[PDB]
mmCIF file of C-alpha atoms in Angstrom:
data_model
loop_
_atom_site.group_PDB
_atom_site.id
_atom_site.type_symbol
_atom_site.label_atom_id
_atom_site.label_comp_id
_atom_site.label_asym_id
_atom_site.label_seq_id
_atom_site.Cartn_x
_atom_site.Cartn_y
_atom_site.Cartn_z
ATOM 1 C CA UNK L 26 99.152 90.147 99.250
ATOM 2 C CA UNK L 27 97.598 93.254 97.746
ATOM 3 C CA UNK L 28 94.769 94.023 100.140
ATOM 4 C CA UNK L 29 91.198 93.517 98.911
ATOM 5 C CA UNK L 30 90.744 97.275 98.941
ATOM 6 C CA UNK L 31 93.335 97.738 96.221
ATOM 7 C CA UNK L 32 91.629 95.073 94.145
ATOM 8 C CA UNK L 33 88.417 97.011 94.653
ATOM 9 C CA UNK L 34 90.122 99.903 92.905
ATOM 10 C CA UNK L 35 88.617 98.562 89.702
ATOM 11 C CA UNK L 36 85.171 99.243 91.113
ATOM 12 C CA UNK L 37 86.072 102.916 90.961
ATOM 13 C CA UNK L 38 86.754 102.434 87.269
ATOM 14 C CA UNK L 39 84.016 99.833 87.002
ATOM 15 C CA UNK L 40 81.377 102.535 86.735
ATOM 16 C CA UNK L 41 83.249 104.359 83.998
ATOM 17 C CA UNK L 42 84.165 101.032 82.443
ATOM 18 C CA UNK L 43 80.821 99.501 81.550
ATOM 19 C CA UNK L 44 78.802 101.003 84.377
ATOM 20 C CA UNK L 45 77.960 97.710 86.041
ATOM 21 C CA UNK L 46 79.720 95.919 88.874
ATOM 22 C CA UNK L 47 77.851 92.814 87.783
ATOM 23 C CA UNK L 48 79.966 92.734 84.645
ATOM 24 C CA UNK L 49 83.160 93.306 86.595
ATOM 25 C CA UNK L 50 81.921 90.864 89.207
ATOM 26 C CA UNK L 51 82.353 88.211 86.543
ATOM 27 C CA UNK L 52 86.007 89.187 86.406
ATOM 28 C CA UNK L 53 88.664 87.563 88.602
ATOM 29 C CA UNK L 54 90.637 89.301 91.361
ATOM 30 C CA UNK L 55 93.901 88.979 89.472
ATOM 31 C CA UNK L 56 92.133 90.879 86.717
ATOM 32 C CA UNK L 57 89.893 93.243 88.645
ATOM 33 C CA UNK L 58 92.827 95.373 89.733
ATOM 34 C CA UNK L 59 94.061 95.016 86.172
ATOM 35 C CA UNK L 60 91.619 97.809 85.426
ATOM 36 C CA UNK L 61 93.581 99.994 87.813
ATOM 37 C CA UNK L 62 96.796 99.109 86.021
ATOM 38 C CA UNK L 63 95.272 99.914 82.652
ATOM 39 C CA UNK L 64 93.674 102.982 84.187
ATOM 40 C CA UNK L 65 97.143 104.166 85.130
ATOM 41 C CA UNK L 66 98.133 103.976 81.482
ATOM 42 C CA UNK L 67 95.290 106.304 80.571
ATOM 43 C CA UNK L 68 96.748 108.762 83.054
ATOM 44 C CA UNK L 69 100.004 108.666 81.127
ATOM 45 C CA UNK L 70 102.853 109.254 83.549
ATOM 46 C CA UNK L 71 104.731 106.081 84.405
ATOM 47 C CA UNK L 72 106.721 106.570 87.586
ATOM 48 C CA UNK L 73 106.050 104.025 90.305
ATOM 49 C CA UNK L 74 108.438 102.423 92.806
#
């Protein structure tokens, strides 16, 4: 069960996202981290275990 810290990884991108945790707060946990997943795409690399 992906720790809550990992799910809070979106918060790091939350600021850059809209710049409001309140907006992201309205997002679910199964989606919050989603930002991290999408964020990874922006990085452009693809190479995870």
